[PDB]
């Protein structure tokens, strides 16, 4: 596996100049200051970057680079994206099930997993929970070892890291670079950038590249990496770090005069002499079923924002049941009976912000797993919102309805239960999908100010219970069609107020000089301005379903049109 | 200025062992691994740490350390706490006005400021806005120079840094350590820790301490810092970093056998021979007036969460005015007239979360400025909540009331305006102080879930407008006394529904077999269950004032009982 590249003048203003070199099958490194091309040449050498502004020729083993390159390579990204709620073995089982083909068997796949575990030396922590400095089960070094082990299951013939030392102890950094030299002895070429190395980890490198501010300063083996600058008139001082001295040369202790010495060097010509000789998946159900399993296990790992929602739903169910237990077929009736229906509708207004972060907390993981070819965007999307839907959208409406009707008995049908439970599910899931679509990239004040403004306007003002909607002039009355709880309130009124008279032998209908001698619900739905046909019960459900589809399409398009490079 | 210390066995489990040394007036450094006492001995040498578990003797110039030590020293903390919305000169003017005494003059103080500016070399950025990688006006190095310059106005005879290199470019790090050696030539002793130094910045150090895992490994000058380990049998390898080699010795390439070589060394005895010879504000109005000025200028620097609140308040004022413009003295009256009063009361429900972060975003700055003796806790508290109160609590109620009554005319008094404006101010400031007290240390889901649960329960359920409160049994009706908008709703009903009959020549009072032949507000307040005396208007204001005082006392005690060490 010989990765090669030639004159890659990457421009987005010209962040890389003309650059060429050959990545021999060893422990190739890329050094330099942070603002240079140390992290950009690595993304150019992987895909990891907009291929439009390349203007170069990256080439593997003589042939140019395929589009099927991120599926056969491996990019261990810098910030550890590994799941800090799963164990090591069920991180690697996940990556095995989504990177290895389904044609092979679970027996062979688990042999591959424990082969990688015994290779990387993870066996004493092969069932502890990985941590992210959130819940402590592993070290930092074994966490980095898991991030390396995930991109080894596919057996990559060419492996990319991205600063595999930063944020670590020097003992763990020396141990992980010794791990890379151990795993590099199978011919597996390893290419990485490093921030501020030391002379301990410098004999490890088979070849060495060095970029500064977009220019190439050196590309050759480390045994004459010092000899180049010792040929250019500089002197390595006594007991001085050479890798740090490479930076002390290029910080001014100009760079246009320092770059050209490599242009007229000997390794420029020897590199170009070989370089011109070189130049002349998985089924959808499987990805859905594994993403949903991973998110279920993550939700069991962090059940703190979910049992909080279950606790508040039980407390709200008990409170609204106790308030509604004091409502009978009496004179103190319909005006508070229409208040408890609004409470039943908007009982899940608090839980809408719990799904504001569903594709935001793991987006550095989503971008990496998508462009490494694990799953599709639609598959990740459906597998994630099939994992928030069951225990955080459908379950609290189940337990809220079974707590409300435990403190009750109003229409014994066992179908008013089902249509109420479906209405609460539709209202809760519609408001939660609105919080997915409308609020994604915002702060801690802005998300809650936004979701309380569209709790003011579209739940208290326009979902008309305390201003009658057929008095507003017809340029502000149209905003009642955008409000979630008006549909749920209408669908619960149409289920509550059908047939019952609420006045046991006290009609008094016909008191014309008086006011409001009307008590039945059939002459209350027309006063509220809502339908009486059975289409008037399901018009609200089809409107909420249209809102769910539109908000989930906005939440899907915000995932599809994400800069994944 | 000779800082000295002897046998400081700090324990919180015994994170420091017995430790002694002498900080000569130079450029003393403290090295080692991160988990050792590199950052803990520095906090022990400053105050910066619980003085209970010290068990040692820190001593300056022969005399023991005064309690007036943080006011005369200077601690440049690691994470830059400098304000990223003010300029350099008005950071230093702030620190001058709160650290230099009020007995001297502004003329001399500004001479001190531009003396420090011309000394540290900040003059070409002496009026640019400091940034925090938020709004870019300075570099990182000039930002660190501002953090150094703030703790130089008091003219400290002994200056503490805390890793003044990490997160910087190596050019800026070498320039800032050359700045420390430049400013150290006036006898100003400088004591710092460093994470991973290089041999470029090693000749600078006058003396050098080195801790590892709580034990002292070396304390002496840097010219024999290598000679100690070259006397202990180790060999410094060719072209190898000595400062990194100090870590390569102590990472195992045990430590109980490596520590005792310094115990039987020559510098142990020579240090102990001198060590045993050694051992044998500002007015409250000024601090309030400068903290409030700093927070006003910070609010002008980031007017993005405030003009958002002003924009939403104008839009809500226009919407509620347009809905209320369709309400007359007609039959479609009191039931929606009691809905628009609830909208007027809870129009600032969205802005309550905008003050959830007021002492949370700057708490690393507050802890440092308190224990460096800038201000009192009560002074910072009052100066900060006098700066959120005017443009984010009082101003939107002003413009909401002047937008609502611009689209109106209901009781021309110019006193209903004032009592409505005061009621909206009290409700808004009470809900915002509740969001200060109840939610401080929480996440992005938890803050909004909490402030929407106590928007469900204490604003829609129990602030009774859509369930009549005098039907609930008297074990859940008591929760109406904890709700903010019930008081504002009662205080606006008592101002709206006094005297007016709402029925122009259509009384019909006395229709006993019929239902609800009552139209006047005086027989509507008794139906709502609220008072008619003028005490019934101000009982709600004194209850809201009690809530403001209790929630602000909780927000003050959470600032007082904060671990400031």
Residue numbers in the entry:
A (entry chain A), B (entry chain B): 35 to 46, 61 to 301, 328 to 354, 370 to 654
What sentences appear in the manuscript?
In this work, we used cryo-EM and biochemical assays to characterize the structures of ABCG2 in the unliganded state, and in the presence of the chemotherapeutic agents imatinib, MXN, or SN38.
In the apo state, ABCG2 adopted a single predominant conformation that was distinct from that seen previously with the Fab or ligand bound transporter. In the absence of 5D3 fab or bound ligands the TM helices adopt a closed conformation while the NBDs remain separate in a nucleotide-free state. In the apo-closed conformation the position of TM5 seals the crevice between ABCG2 monomers where substrates and inhibitors bound in the previous inward facing structures. However, the helical rotation of TM5 observed in our apo-closed structure causes the Phe545 sidechain to face the opposite ABCG2 monomer. In the apo-closed conformation the positioning of TM5 results in these sidechains being oriented towards the dimer interface, such that a sulfur cluster of 10 cysteines and methionines along TM5 and TM2 is formed at the central 2-fold axis between ABCG2 monomers. Whereas the middle portion of TM2 (residues 434–438) adopts a helical character in the previous inward facing and ATP bound structures, this stretch of helix unwinds and bows outwards towards the lateral sides of the transporter in our apo-closed structure. However, as a result of the helical unraveling of TM2 observed in our apo-closed structure the Phe439 phenyl moiety is flipped ~180° outward and away from the 2-fold axis.
